[PDB]
Symmetry: D2
Subunit: 389 residues, 4 copies
């Protein structure tokens, strides 16, 4: 019944890098337009825009709506943002599918968007500070990467999972290197080109078109990897090298009923067969995808074995290993072109980013059944099953 007509994501920017001063909605605008052009659908025909975005402090009222207008979706349409942290990008798409499934909408653009670079520092100062220093809080750290119940960073959560699953430093380092190697391979081979819509960084002293994921590291070594110090646990195992990065970007999908696509001449990228969200203990939030993936499969009537391709977000090597290990899916069909450790992890947009990767990879290799999953801070997982047409 509901299909993904088309899809597009911007390249993934490094932190304070290519998109350093670009407001997320800008990145979103371009993705909204791309999905529209790629399916031959006019912005005028868009009923609603849903955009997962975790850190919009100071970007003004509802960046989703600013993105939609910037891209030309008429003012008669609607737009909103939502936040299930890292599952935000994928959850948006589910939510948008529900919009058409309940008959409240016909065509929706959904995904996520995030400028981690542009997230401001803040302080509650209405009462006034009579005396003494006060903290200016980094909303990126506090609102997107800190567990709100234990007060520690996501990396600590990953350390909890490493210990629990007995995942050594070498084994998390081995996984990251492979991730970099696969992503680099993919990039050289033109594998990210279909899904990427080039973004124009509007300059003054010149415009700069970005069309390549700049965080991927070329020639990543195991030696350099092994020399890094633990980033969260002083005598820990998680490093800057075996953990995803801080990044900016946007990604989305054009959804509509299979019938509608059919009436249009559009050849969909896939049919949303099912999706699932489930909670877990915040301390081991990286285990989130296990239950969520299984739930989604259950709802689709699929067996783990039925999958031809998987995209399981790499928040941290230790959680990614745990997930694969538990689920037992064939490593070889997971993150075929690299994962977040290489490509980057723009919080609110990462679920839509990985959906794009999955979707263009299923088309190119002809795979039939695919699944995208992500772990979520606070103890949750989100998964989506897709079947090609």
């Amino acid at each position: 019944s509901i299909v993904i007509a088309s899809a597009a994501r911007t390249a993934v920017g490094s932190f304070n890098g290519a998109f350093a001063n670009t407001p997320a909605h800008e990145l979103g605008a371009t993705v909204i337009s791309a999905v529209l052009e790629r399916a031959g659908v006019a912005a005028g025909e868009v009923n609603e825009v849903i955009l997962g975005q975790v850190l919009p402090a100071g970007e003004g009222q509802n960046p989703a709506r600013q993105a939609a207008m910037k891209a030309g979706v008429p003012q008669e349409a609607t737009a909103w943002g939502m936040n299930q942290l890292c599952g935000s990008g994928l959850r948006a798409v589910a939510l948008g599918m529900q919009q058409i499934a309940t008959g409240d909408a016909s065509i929706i653009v959904a995904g996520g968007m995030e400028s981690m670079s542009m997230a401001p520092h803040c302080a509650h100062l209405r009462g006034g500070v009579k005396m003494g220093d006060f903290k200016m809080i980094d909303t990126m750290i506090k609102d997107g990467l800190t567990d709100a119940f234990y007060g520690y960073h996501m990396g600590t959560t990953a350390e909890n999972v490493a210990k629990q699953w007995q995942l050594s430093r070498d084994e998390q380092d081995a996984f990251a290197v492979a991730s970099q190697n696969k992503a680099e391979a993919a990039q050289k081979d033109g594998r990210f080109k279909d899904e990427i819509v080039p973004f124009i960084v509007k300059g003054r002293k010149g415009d700069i078109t970005v069309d390549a994921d700049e965080y991927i590291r070329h020639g990543a070594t195991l030696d350099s990897m092994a020399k890094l110090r633990p980033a969260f646990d002083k005598e820990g195992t998680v490093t800057a090298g075996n953990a995803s990065g801080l990044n900016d970007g946007a990604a989305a999908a054009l959804l509509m009923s299979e019938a509608e696509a059919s009436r249009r001449g559009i050849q969909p990228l896939g049919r949303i067969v099912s999706w699932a969200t489930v909670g877990v203990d915040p301390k081991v939030m990286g285990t989130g995808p296990i239950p969520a993936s299984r739930k989604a499969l259950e709802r689709a009537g699929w067996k783990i074995g039925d999958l031809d391709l998987v995209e399981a977000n790499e928040a941290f090597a230790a959680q990614a290993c745990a997930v694969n290990k538990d689920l037992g899916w064939d490593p070889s069909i997971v993150n075929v072109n690299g994962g977040a450790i290489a490509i980057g992890h723009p919080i609110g947009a990462s679920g839509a980013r990985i959906l794009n990767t999955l979707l263009f990879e299923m088309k190119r290799r002809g795979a039939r059944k695919g699944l995208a999953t992500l772990c979520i801070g606070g103890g949750m997982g989100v998964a989506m099953c897709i079947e090609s047409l």
Copy 2:
């Protein structure tokens, strides 16, 4: 099909008043447990918590999850925040309804929370400021009350509607006084008591139980109203007395299929017959409710005259009069117990706040059909039709 088993809202506090240092997720927690308690449903049976909240900057990862966990909802359920500005609160209920309608969940707690008081000041400072002064931005104003397209305040958008609908000062002032008198009248007769769930302001030198809307003004006079100066247009017509306030508050609804409610021996507050969202010109966003209400009515198969009760959000006197003027519904059945001008307007929670009043008034006066509607910044409207059982 989908019914609101129960509901509850906190009292609405004034700006920097009783809830001044209360983070929105603490009020959220209170309301979520009330709804459970009220329906006789254990925390453990909740599948998901959906909370609209426009100003979470500084509160930490996904405040919706923090509310859930604090209220006893196990780590297995899931939670997420969403923003559709003042439409958030109501929109969330519709989204939860859809969670059930598509068989993705059985029981959902939905509504909104907001702490305007706790909204921080911010500035983007990763790039550094090499030389010169910079502005510390009030996130409540930028991210909550400032049009992102014209850069002006919602107040000005109200002025645009005033001029366009030729709504004099005296006319808006009249409207304001009435909502105060009506909000004061209802508070005096205990009309808000079923909906309110007392909130314990955890103190040090004393704990304070808040159970009354502190923002309503007793004995509002027209003379005092007419002596106030325009707050947005220097030679304008909108003032602080005929505009909504800056407030704190949380409100939520417990949703489940009608059959499920019957399986549990619950007497529902009503069934959600339809809902709708439509966009309009951002300049006159106050008109929001006209197109959305009509749509909602159309989808429910109801006529304007079928409505027994109506709750149409009092963002500004100007917009409220324009809404009622155009729709034509009998004034006496609209905001019978006062509106946001007197009660308050905790942006992300308001849509669920006005559903609570609609819901408990419909039960108390035995009205069968009702409609809640709000105007949304950026030019949008949200509407929902509820029928008692």
Copy 3:
């Protein structure tokens, strides 16, 4: 040789009290004009204005010149601030006297000024914060009250003194309550009137004339002093009751040669007979007045027993008790009208504020020889000897 022709001070304001929003140079301006007027000296005759000031951040270019200009001092004269912390206001008078002694000026207005209440919060942001929270530093605490060598407050230096000299809590509390009772008695008998020049806080909704020290507590009790908790060492002895306060004010003197006072028929408040400044260990900075007063007396050719009156600043009861114990001067001739624990401590102005208190009490009771001394953060003392004529 060099005399003090006249002097004046403003009443000392409470933290965030009467002068909460009054920049220091405005207080300074009134005291430069009272001094001129009190001596029969016109502003066109001033050569230079010298003002101690420790916390001028955010006030603009050289506030000493802003105060001199506001008082009508001609643009041909010059002005400069200096900073020897609490010894500033007194040390300015000694540097003004040297301007004259070396023949480079004939008429100087010297003293201090401080708005502790207007000191801002700051942060070094030129390089930017790539990520993580940063502190907004309270310039009053950082630049005015925190030792830069040990990182702790001036109050801890007082705890070091309390321990080393074995001053109990009881004795420190007895000292602070005699301070209060003495200042209150002098206030009620009109003893502060000659020295206070009234300050007009320019309002909008009314101008307020402040001519009374508002920090002096009336009816201070030993019981209330004794129940206060230690302010700096959780199991310390220094409290808010037995410590000076954070205050605002300005004070000054008009200086010229004795021969010049004599050509003008002026009856000077005193002859500056000597002064001195010496360092001590920062950890016990509060003992500064010992060596500085001993040095000043030696330079004057005076024994301690020759003094008729003393003003030794009350930064903290502990340190004032140690100075008194060590020096051995008759306690009934020291701070006869109360001192800083009751009157307050506007850091850069205090040295001139206690010099005003000495001069007007020496003229009142006919005391021939006096001495004013103050302890200084970072381990220093300053002291000056005055003889009447």
Copy 4:
């Protein structure tokens, strides 16, 4: 009677340059140690350290003492900062001289220090900001470079001087470029080595020794200077090319009586014969060196024509040309090694920076009579005459 036994300065850093994160007091300690070492004078013989500094906000209690303590000056000595804006570095040396002249000290270290790069942004937040955006004030701009009476930059006072003296854009650029070429040539020839003491910028990933004035531009061209846009008056004449820069550095002199230097066998850098400080109209502050230099010469009993070398600070080429036009001294003996447009202008230290330049050049060419003079914000000048021994 009072001689400068030795002197030293650090190289001048570019804004956010080599000493971007080096607090002034660390630069000042290196110069205090250098004057001592240069004269055969041990740190335990020092009575007082006097350091002009206009921007100490956020550095902690009295940076002059911090500098002194860091250099090994005993805690029994004293230290203070003072501020007469750009004349501060030179005024401190006259101020040190007066301490010996009056018998209150035997050995003084005086000069100035400044980290314009380390100057913070601030806001008065004690009273609280109920709502709205507020300004984070650049203290270097506000407290160091803006006139307090007219509210405009020091550069607009340079435009006023330009119009009034009818100094064209061409004349200003030609002086600027001659400044750069003369400093490049003295740099390359090694004439700045004697005066400069190398500064070790403590690294983490390497210590860096800074011993060269980095602001100096090599190969400055008239053409690129001519193409610059006006920086303060949109259709003005003062540009970033013909104005001084924003810089970092420290500079000092070690003083003692002539008799004392003779007892020690010290061959002093010169005898302080007179100094003067005079005010002028704040709007044409750049003219202050005129009256101050004539006054200093008159106190020395010298004619302008008796001078063999002059250092006249280059706040802006417009005022520098005005000063040279009025005084009429031979331009060939003024700033023979370039000035502040090329070397840089660390406000609090500049006075001493140009006095080291003057002294070391008088020693190398055998110049007997010299003068150092600087213009001061707020309408003032300072100047000092020096005679070789």
